[PDB]
Design a protein around this ligand. Structure first.
Ligand SMILES: Cc1cc2nc3c(=O)[nH]c(=O)nc-3n(C[C@H](O)[C@H](O)[C@H](O)COP(=O)(O)O)c2cc1C
Ligand SMILES: Cc1cc2nc3c(=O)[nH]c(=O)nc-3n(C[C@H](O)[C@H](O)[C@H](O)COP(=O)(O)O)c2cc1C
Lengths: 120, 120
């Protein structure tokens, strides 16, 4: 597990896939923008993510990839994760406050991780 | 357009989303692993991508995010793209050869770009 937390601190772009009625949608954030709480909750600051919110309002299911070449994984150098969870947009509580330093943030995207597999 | 080509040369992880019958799927590669040909074709070396190929055999539609903080975009520092295209697995031709230096590559994933929007 300690691999995952070292990845959060490093440089890297996160990818977030949602399910629409017109196919998947795909958006980004930075590894270091993420905030982890208890209950397997990863919190994302929301500036835009309008299409994403539309998709999530209808289908909680989300996928996320993140990693870093600086954190050593399965076959030595580098590591990547594929995370499956359920998503929710929150405007209040501990989850919104975790990302509150991002003054531009209109909401928090809260991903509750159901599984994480190392892909690298 | 010259922004896109500068992004390919830089450090960065690409995200590729496909449509399954069980929801979206999401896989990675590196910006510098990509190969661009004419006909709006971006070529990806395939080592694994078994679930991805299953999804693509059924639904050509694909989304891709890639970028770099080192290439200056819309609001100054950084740039990201969201690419929509159609995918195909090729085992021969110019498209496979473009990625042939990757000896581990069993195939080429060929993305024909229908649209690219700057997201950063
Ligand atoms: C590297 C990168 C990081 C980004 N970080 C965020 C972010 O932290 N929060 C956010 O709302 N959008 C971020 N964006 C923009 C989103 O990917 C997305 O385009 C925008 O939020 C609109 O979302 P939507 O397409 O679901 O409407 C980032 C884009 C890039 C390329
Ligand atoms: C940073 C990173 C780069 C990767 N590059 C490739 C790649 O270039 N080609 C490839 O087949 N898989 C690559 N992978 C692994 C794929 O994301 C994926 O897990 C694997 O190919 C299996 O595909 P599938 O889940 O569709 O079966 C990479 C993973 C990471 C984290």
């Amino acid at each position: 597990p300690g691999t995952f937390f070292e990845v959060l601190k490093n440089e890297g772009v996160v990818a977030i896939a949602t399910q629409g009625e017109d196919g998947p949608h795909l958006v980004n954030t930075y590894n270091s923008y993420l905030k982890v709480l208890d209950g397997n909750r990863i919190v994302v600051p929301v500036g835009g993510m309008h299409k994403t919110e539309a998709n999530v309002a209808r289908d909680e299911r989300v996928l996320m990839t993140l990693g870093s070449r600086k954190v050593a994984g399965r076959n030595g150098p580098g590591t990547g994760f594929l995370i499956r969870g359920s998503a929710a947009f929150r405007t209040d509580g501990p989850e919104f406050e975790a990302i509150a330093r991002f003054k531009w943030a209109r909401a928090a995207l809260v991903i509750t991780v159901v599984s994480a597999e190392q892909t690298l």
